[PDB]
């Protein structure tokens, strides 16, 4: 089937607002003296030096 | 399948069926060459 009518801008906007990214939760880690922020999942990798903290 | 497309290229056949010598052979072809020249086409024939 095909859209029978142009969707009103209100409906378009309301449905399009649902396409959004979730902000990653950032945890502090101590690497090389300075403090960096990485996902808690990568916290162990950062501690073990496995994360390329630019 | 049999997916042979219509244009099967062949340069000899192209030249002998649409080429300059063919076009100049007959009155109609000479007229076509002259009409094409009058239009200004760069490629008067094959």
């Amino acid at each position: 089937a095909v859209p029978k009518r142009r969707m009103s801008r209100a409906n378009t906007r309301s449905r399009r607002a649902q396409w959004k990214a979730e902000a990653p939760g950032l945890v502090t880690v101590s690497v090389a003296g300075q403090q960096r922020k990485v996902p808690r999942r990568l916290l162990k990798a950062a501690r073990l030096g496995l994360v390329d903290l630019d | 399948a049999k997916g042979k497309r219509t244009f099967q290229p062949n340069n000899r056949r192209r030249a002998r069926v649409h080429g300059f010598r063919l076009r100049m052979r007959t009155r109609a072809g000479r007229a076509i060459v002259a009409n094409r020249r009058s239009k200004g086409r760069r490629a008067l024939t094959a």
């Binding site: 999942r41 990568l42 162990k44 990798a45 073990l48 496995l50 994360v51 390329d52 | -």
Partner: protein, 118 residues
């Protein structure tokens, strides 16, 4: 070990078996292989069970690890170094560390290591 619940890792059962064999080979060869997180999770049991065969010195376990691994260098490595190395450790021979996602398809990545405290 426990089969794969969902669709198999490589794209088929045979390719998953081959992929687990190759990942186990690399894991035993380097001690540290980076691969997509689901591959690492599937490999942890596979590799730990090969190491279980290697931990006990027997020609029968030699042949079992061989019918899994098919890499004589790494089979010797197992049965000579990694066998006696885990003589006292009872399970959990390896470790999974989740690392950044792959920039290409944003896949979850994880490194599998062999444990080395004792």
């Amino acid at each position: 070990p426990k089969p794969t619940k969902g669709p198999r890792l490589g794209g088929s059962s045979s390719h998953q078996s081959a992929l687990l064999a190759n990942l186990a080979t690399s894991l035993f060869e380097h001690g540290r292989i980076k691969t997509t997180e689901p591959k690492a999770r599937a490999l942890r049991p596979y590799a730990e069970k090969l190491i279980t065969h290697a931990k006990k010195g027997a020609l029968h376990n030699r042949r079992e690890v061989m019918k899994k691994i098919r890499d004589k260098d790494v089979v010797h490595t197992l049965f000579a170094e990694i066998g006696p190395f885990y003589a006292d450790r009872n399970g959990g021979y390896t470790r999974i560390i989740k690392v950044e996602n792959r920039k290409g398809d944003n896949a979850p990545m994880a490194v599998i290591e062999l444990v080395r405290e004792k």
